[PDB]
Amino acid sequence: YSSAQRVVRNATSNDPTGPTTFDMEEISSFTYQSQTEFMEVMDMLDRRLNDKGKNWRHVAKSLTVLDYLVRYGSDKCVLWAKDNLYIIKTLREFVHFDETNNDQGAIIRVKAKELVSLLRDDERLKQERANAKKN
Numbered sequence: 391y392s393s394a395q396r397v398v399r400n401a402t403s404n405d406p407t408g409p410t411t412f413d414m415e416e417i418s419s420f421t422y423q424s425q426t427e428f429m430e431v432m433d434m435l436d437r438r439l440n441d442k443g444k445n446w447r448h449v450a451k452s453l454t455v456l457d458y459l460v461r462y463g464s465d466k467c468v469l470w471a472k473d474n475l476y477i478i479k480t481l482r483e484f485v486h487f488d489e490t491n492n493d494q495g496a497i498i499r500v501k502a503k504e505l506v507s508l509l510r511d512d513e514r515l516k517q518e519r520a521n522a523k524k525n
């Protein structure tokens with residue numbers, strides 16, 4: 391793994407805490423570097439979004455990072471998310487009952503539904519990204 395990949399993995403691990411704001415700022419900064427590094431970041435989010443069951447936090451945290459990247463990361467992040475809208479839409483139905491039979495999947499479904507809606511709302515996203523760049 392590259393350094394950027396280790397950070398993305400750290401920020402999307404099973405640890406029930408995180409990612410932090412600094413974690414997401416760091417990952418966002420990685421998307422403004424080489425195309426190779428940008429692709430390494432998105433590929434690792436892609437890999438985490440494919441996890442299931444007990445590893446549900448990998449999916450929830452990766453959706454958190456991805457929503458942050460669509461608003462603060464490079465424009466290529468928005469392009470990746472739109473090109474891969476299928477993945478995000480599929481996660482709107484994610485299910486995972488834990489040991490006490492609580493469906494921790496609700497967290498993932500909400501985040502996926504919210505991200506699909508943000509990607510749909512092109513003008514809203516444009517103005518939110520412009521405000522981020524303004525600052």
Ligand SMILES: [Cl-]
Nearest residue numbers: 402403404405
């Ligand atoms: Cl982990």
Ligand SMILES: [Cl-]
Nearest residue numbers: 441442443445
């Ligand atoms: Cl898994």
Ligand SMILES: [Cl-]
Nearest residue numbers: 463464465466
């Ligand atoms: Cl940009």
Ligand SMILES: [Cl-]
Nearest residue numbers: 503504507508
């Ligand atoms: Cl809506």
